[PDB]
Amino acid sequence: SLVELGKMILQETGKNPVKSYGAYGCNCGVLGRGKPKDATDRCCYVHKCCYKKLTNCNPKKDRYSYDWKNKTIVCGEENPCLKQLCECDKAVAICLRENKGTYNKKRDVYLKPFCDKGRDC
Amino acid sequence: SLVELGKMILQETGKNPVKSYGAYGCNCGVLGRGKPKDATDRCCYVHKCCYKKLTNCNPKKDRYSYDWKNKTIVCGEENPCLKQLCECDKAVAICLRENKGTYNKKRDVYLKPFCDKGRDC
């Protein structure tokens, strides 16, 4: 859920996940997918397609455990669905950190007027 | 939708809805419910119980029309679902305005600093 995902983003990027990625581009936050605007948007695109392959758990509400060892997200053993979900969340947190260099404040809202329909995952 | 809900909260409270309420307490913003920490937190708890009654529409995605008359939110006539959704969104904006005097900036973060399981809607 967002408790784990938002914490990972905070730990990797240092940014408020709700205010910085709650509605970034066409793919970051809620409101689904779309053709990505930038590298940051592409990370969230990757992420939501990771989520869609998961069907035995609920990424929105299911909780899971992980720990922070040597400043690295270490996913715990849960079951396979929850461990797969942990890995999706870890991947996007690292991705967003690596593309902070091109984060653009221009694209942080909720109407999505220019977002095109995304291709199938 | 999210657009109308955020616009209402801005019009009533004068605050940035995402920065001020995107993660306030246990019930404001971020998905999930819990024992409210104060009155502002309780406004969002009632709001999420309001949403759960609705099945014929999507609260997050479905747009509805409302108006601003005599500095008052006035819901348009929509269908019964969208009308009830507008009235839920209107009540949460008014409630947050009413309880601004006890707004506690110790409480606007998303990890759910640790909330107890909420009572049933």
Author numbering:
A (entry chain B), B (entry chain A): 1 to 13, 15 to 53, 57 to 61, 67 to 88, 90 to 123, 125 to 127, 129 to 133
Text from the published report:
PLA2-like proteins are catalytically inactive proteins due to some natural amino acid substitutions, including Asp49Lys and Tyr28Asn, leading to Ca+2 coordination inability. Some of these regions comprise the myotoxic site (Lys20, Lys115 and Arg118) — subsequently called the membrane docking site (MDoS) — and the membrane disruption site (MDiS) composed of the conserved residues Leu121 and Phe12533. In this work, we studied the binding behaviour between MjTX-I, a myotoxic PLA2s-like isolated from Bothrops moojeni venom, and the suramin molecule using a broad combination of techniques, including myographic assays, molecular dynamic simulations, dynamic light scattering (DLS), small angle X-ray scattering (SAXS), isothermal titration calorimetry (ITC) and X-ray crystallography.
The MjTX-I/suramin crystal structure displays two toxin protomers that interact through one suramin molecule, leading to a PLA2-like compact dimeric assembly formation. According to the crystallographic structure, suramin binds to both protomers of the MjTX-I homodimeric structure making different contacts in each protomer, so we considered the binding events as non-identical. Comparison of the monomers of native MjTX-I and the monomers of the toxin complexed with suramin yielded an average RMSD lower than 0.8 Å, revealing that ligand binding did not affect the tertiary structure of the protein. While the native MjTX-I crystal structure is composed of two dimers in an “extended assembly” that gives rise to a tetrameric array, the MjTX-I/suramin complex presents a dimeric “compact assembly”. The distances between Cβ from the residues (Leu122 and Phe125) were between 8–9 Å for both monomers. Thus, according to this classification, both monomers of MjTX-I/suramin are in the non-canonical conformation and are thus unable to interact with membranes. The first one is related to the natural substitution Arg118Asp from the MDoS region of the MjTX-I. The second is related to the binding of the suramin molecule that hides several basic residues, particularly Arg34, Lys49, Lys53, Lys69, and Lys70, which are related to the putative-MDoS suggested in the previous section. Thus, MjTX-I inhibition by the suramin may be related to two causes: (i) distortion of MDiS from both monomers impairing the membrane disruption mechanism by the toxin; and (ii) surface electrostatic changes of the complex that interfere with the toxin membrane dockage process (putative-MDoS is partially hidden).
